[PDB]
Amino acid sequence: PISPIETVPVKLKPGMDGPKVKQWPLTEEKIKALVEICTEMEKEGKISKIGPENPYNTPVFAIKWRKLVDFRELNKRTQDFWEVQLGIPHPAGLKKKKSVTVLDVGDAYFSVPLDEDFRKYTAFTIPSINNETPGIRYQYNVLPQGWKGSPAIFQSSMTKILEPFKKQNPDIVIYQYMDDLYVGSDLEIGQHRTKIEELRQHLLRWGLTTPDKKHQKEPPFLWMGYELHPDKWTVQPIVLPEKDSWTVNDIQKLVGKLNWASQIYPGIKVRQLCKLLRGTKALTEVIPLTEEAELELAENREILKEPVHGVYYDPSKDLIAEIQKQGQGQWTYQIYQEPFKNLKTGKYARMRGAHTNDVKQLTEAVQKITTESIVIWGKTPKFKLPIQKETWETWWTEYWQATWIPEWEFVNTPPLVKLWYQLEKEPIVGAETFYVDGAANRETKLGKAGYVTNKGRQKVVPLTNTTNQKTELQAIYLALQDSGLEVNIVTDSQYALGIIQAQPDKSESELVNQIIEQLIKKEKVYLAWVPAHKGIGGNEQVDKLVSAGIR
Amino acid sequence: IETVPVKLKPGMDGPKVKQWPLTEEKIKALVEICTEMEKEGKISKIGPENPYNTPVFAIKKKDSTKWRKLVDFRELNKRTQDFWEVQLGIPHPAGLKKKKSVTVLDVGDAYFSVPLDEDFRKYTAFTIPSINNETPGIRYQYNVLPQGWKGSPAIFQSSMTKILEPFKKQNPDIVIYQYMDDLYVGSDLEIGQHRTKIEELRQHLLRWGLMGYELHPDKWTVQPIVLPEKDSWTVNDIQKLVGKLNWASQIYPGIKVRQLCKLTKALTEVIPLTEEAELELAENREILKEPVHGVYYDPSKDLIAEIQKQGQGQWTYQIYQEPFKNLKTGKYAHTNDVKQLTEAVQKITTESIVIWGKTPKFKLPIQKETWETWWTEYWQATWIPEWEFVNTPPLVKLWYQ
Ligand SMILES: O=C1c2ccccc2C(=O)N1CCOC(=S)Nc1ccc(Cl)cc1
């Protein structure tokens, strides 16, 4: 039908006029196919015949028989509407329901009126055998199939229609997603079917037809990759193929599927499968699976061995979010309300820092979950974390960055998190003092890194291809090698200081990793900074001999 | 009745900013606030033919029990400037900042009176979100001057002046400044006297639609970079000492670091103070507590503010337009890093407003995500400053202790 709902005022963009692209003659049968389809729609009210007034026309054509109307120009020329693409509810946020049923709207778009003042711009022509004969002029009376604004005005139309019913039935839940309506409630099979008939009828009062009980449709539901039961949810069924040869495209899809599963499957890892990708290559290139990868796929297959389902949200309970350190830079979490009935799983390996440690990673993960928890449940979860509340304050307080974790508490699930070394807050007595320094010729890209000591010692190991910066980490590194269990170091590089002063426990930097490894071996390390190019007995000294030649 | 034809900038287009995900309780709060507002016709439902959007938050009155809706017109403001600034700009009185006491009155409740130019209402579109996106989400637009929009005060001046006129004439020494939803009124009167004059003012406003903030700008002093007094310096002590002396060097023309310098060496080793030593810092001390030489406010170049976390509820901050030529630098001290930083910002912003009549853009030493999550949870002010996230250069934090 065509809904008696009021129309949405539409407009073209400020400095533009309707579309006027000429019609490109079609084949005999396509002509025939169109004339048929157009007469049918015409009787239904979907379209109308217009006088040679409308200077507007947009190309039309047919494909095997249905009618496709290209609206590129009308589109580009139309306007912008309130985004329809905003956010997809997550199943884990859903309240449990007793009866669930799904109704789809037939010819949704064609069921909804188009602003009268705008109908003229949709005018299109049915070509004669070639040209050489006027041609049947048509304009739309309802939301055309590929025109922007349809997805939006429809959703608007549907809402305002659904309004009253919702008002008269607050306990009932209705979710609109495209041609579909999902309807849930806490009623028993009979009495819910009644309420749905009360809905279908209501919906028909407004021009929307739906399938009858006969050809309805029952749970589970397959929505956006999920499988939705009224009492539980999971991700859509998924089979990891058994193969000898894996193409990049094969492993691509695999990594994708795994990630999607980790939404509810705990323990999923893809690190070893992602490495296999690192590096430019064609999607047809076969890649032999490294040993870790071969095993990763093993377990992954194991935790997927048996179906697993997430529970739905009970508003009257707290959310318990739990986090575990699995491997390096890898973090997994679970969210439940009753010890171990998960609502959703998840993993986290994102760490945009060039250099970083566990306590920051852990806090970052917590932040992600926090925000993820906000949109899903609208409240914040209680956290259980593998970090001593003391080994967190220490960090919290000394760090230069502002933090804040929601209510959390220690949970003892190794590996636990901790600082793998602490820098001294004051100098060390009877500790060799190392004035380190770096240098490098901008042209030539070569340089030298060394140090001098209050005990007379001196070194100057030369390096090959490195930046002015690297001749600074290399030196502070040097000082670490030849020094005792307990030494203080002076630099003029706020760079190195910065990197080292934030207690990194890992880095995407060969050198930094070694320094860390060394930092962990010591017992007391104190690092200090002086301004370069002053008269500092030491820095100047190491500068003299580090900058002698090649600088 | 008479609506002021608001016209967006030439070329620029309406705001299209996503609504930040809100907690259940703020939503409930907002749905109530908004049902009331449209009931009283201040806002209207709107169709999908309106593509614009501005984020909206819920804040609690003045740390009380009553919720207040807060719109983020940052973006709309940036695209309306010419109008609110060059068009109907409000002049900033230098006198304000010298007064003994400044009170801050929220007078935004007055804009709802004046109607908004129908042709401009569409850009004030905003959205109330829903949990897990289970319901589409309620879209409104304003039919009347909205609170957080620099366009309002600009448009409301004719009325505000009319209103304040009588009071101003009877109190020609009292200074009154308007800045987004707030009145800043300051006098050199004694506390009680001042407070009476505020009430006496409050009754004037009351006739056009309803001790706010006790502020003493004349008592605001510079946080001088401080040099230790010690008693027996070590290589380390003196080393760090010239460290910041060098930093200050880059500001405060005249700072001298040498003498100290000439003074290989062990780190723990103590060292005697040189006759040429005292001479130095002594004089470096003299300067530093004095105001910068050569630095001045440039009314056309907006203010940038940094804040470092000195730990222990301590926070240092500077305000400047060109890095290191700073107009001002101070300090600030269930409390958490984010709670305190949110206060530090409001504090810094308020002073800024009193002094220059504009907010600074903040370099917040936090994680965007973290800040965006929590900032609203402690925020109270009716305006929002431009911010930005960064990493406190280790040494900086120290040179401002
Ligand atoms: O938001 C939705 C979505 C999203 C995707 C699919 C179905 C539904 C739905 O019914 N709603 C309305 C709320 O449904 C609620 S609260 N609970 C449900 C809904 C649907 C099902 Cl199958 C189980 C549990």
CA–CA dist B238, A488 (Å, integer): 16
Query: DSSP per residue over A237-262, as a string?
Result: P------SS-BHHHHHHHHHHHHHHT
Residue at which a domain ends, from B224, B248, B282: B224
Domain of residue B261 covers 225-296
Beta pairing partners, B364:
B389
C-alpha neighbours within 13 Å on the C-beta side of residue B218:
11
Last residue of a domain, one of B235, B264, B296: B296
Q: Does residue A99 contact residue A8 with C-beta atoms inside 8 Å?
A: no
Measured at the alpha carbon of residue B365, what is the angle toward residues B361 and B370, in degrees to the nearest 5? Answer: 100
How buried is B16 (Cβ within 10 angstroms: 0-12 exposed, 13-18 middle, 19+ buried)?
Answer: middle
Domain count across chain B: 4
Pick the residue of A529, A536, A540 with the most B CBs within 10 A to test the interface with B by mutation: A536
Q: Which two tokens stand for residue A484?
A: 């005792």
Residue of A nearest to B256 (CA): A534
Q: Are residues B146 and B161 in the same domain?
A: no
3-state secondary structure of B249: helix
Q: For chain B, count helices (H), then strands (E).
A: 10, 14
Nearest to B290 by CA among B198, B197, B334, B225: B225
Take residue B33 and report the two structure tokens written for it.
């606030």
Query: How many CB pairs below 8 Å do chains A and B form together?
Result: 182
Quote the CA–CA distance of A233 and A263 in Å, as a whole number: 11
CATH number where B384 lies: 3.30.70.270
- Interchain contact A431–B (C-beta under 8 A): yes
Q: Give the three-class secondary structure for A111.
A: helix
Are residues B53 and B32 part of one domain?
A: yes
Per the structure block, which two tokens stand in for B123?
């850009």
Enumerate the domain spans of chain A: 1-84+110-150, 85-109+151-219, 220-313, 314-420, 421-548
CB contact under 8 A, A452 and B264: yes
Q: For chain B, how are helix, strand and coil distributed in percent, rounded to 5?
A: 35, 20, 45
Six token digits for residue A239: 């089979």
CA pair distance A539, A532, nearest whole angstrom = 7
Residue A380: both structure tokens together: 């914040």
* Phi, psi of B82, deg, nearest 5: -20, -45
Residue at which a domain ends, from B161, B194, B224:
B224
Note whether A13 and A79 are within 8 A (CB): yes
**Taking the domain A421-548, which CATH number applies?**
3.30.420.10
Is A244 annotated among the ligand-binding residues? no
Which CATH architecture fits A1-84+110-150? Roll (3.10)
Regarding whether B148 and B4 lie in a shared domain, the answer is yes
**What count of residues does chain B have?**
401
CB contact under 8 A, B262 and A159: no
| Residue B128 to residues A370, B19, B121, Cα–Cα distance (Å) | 21, 8, 17
Tokens of A290: 């490294």
With a 6 A CB cut-off, is A94 part of the ligand 1 pocket?
yes
Flag whether B231 is marked binding. no
Pairing of strands B361-364, B304-309: parallel
Order of strands across the sheet with B43-45? Answer: B43-45, B138-142, B126-128
Separation of alpha carbons B50 and A79, rounded Å = 10
DSSP-derived secondary structure for A167-200: HH-TT-EEEEETTEEEEEES--HHHHHHHHHHHH
Q: For B272, which DSSP code?
A: P
Nearest of A457, A412, A416, A411 to residue A434 by alpha carbon: A457
Method of determination is X-ray
- Residue B20 shares a structural domain with residue B145: yes
CA distance A344 to chain B (A): 14
Contact status, residue B242 vs residue A531, Cβ threshold 8 Å: yes
How far apart are the C-alpha atoms of A439 and A547, rounded to whole Å? Answer: 6
Evaluate whether A1-84+110-150 and A85-109+151-219 have a shared fold.
Answer: no
CATH annotation of A220-313: 3.30.70.270
Per the CB < 8 Å rule, is B51 touching A79?
Answer: yes
Helix (H, G, I), strand (E, B) or coil at A322: strand
**Residue A97 Cβ contacting ligand 1 at under 6 Å:** yes
- Which ligand 1 atom is the nearest neighbour of the CA of A228? 22
CATH of A85-109+151-219, one of 3.40.50.300, 3.40.50.280, 3.30.70.270, 3.60.20.10: 3.30.70.270
User: Are residues B358 and B286 located together in one domain of the fold?
Assistant: no
Same domain, B380 and B273: no
Residue B36, CA distances (Å) to A155, A233, A306, B117 in order = 25, 38, 52, 22
How long a stretch of residues is chain A? Answer: 551
Residues B101 and B144 in one domain: no
Are B96 and B186 within one domain? yes
For B324-381, where are the alpha helices, taking DSSP H only?
337-356, 368-374
**Closest to A68 (Cα-Cα) out of A81, A58, A55, A56:** A58
Nearest to A542 by CA among A445, A421, A422, A457: A457
Answer for the pair A224, A88: CB distance below 8 angstroms, yes or no.
yes
Residue A107 assigned to a binding site: no
Q: Name the residue of chain B whose CA is nearest to A78's CA.
A: B49
Q: Of the candidates B236, B239, B366, which has its C-beta nearest A401's C-beta?
A: B366
CATH class of the domain comprising A314-420:
alpha beta
Q: Do B50 and B174 lie in a common domain?
A: no
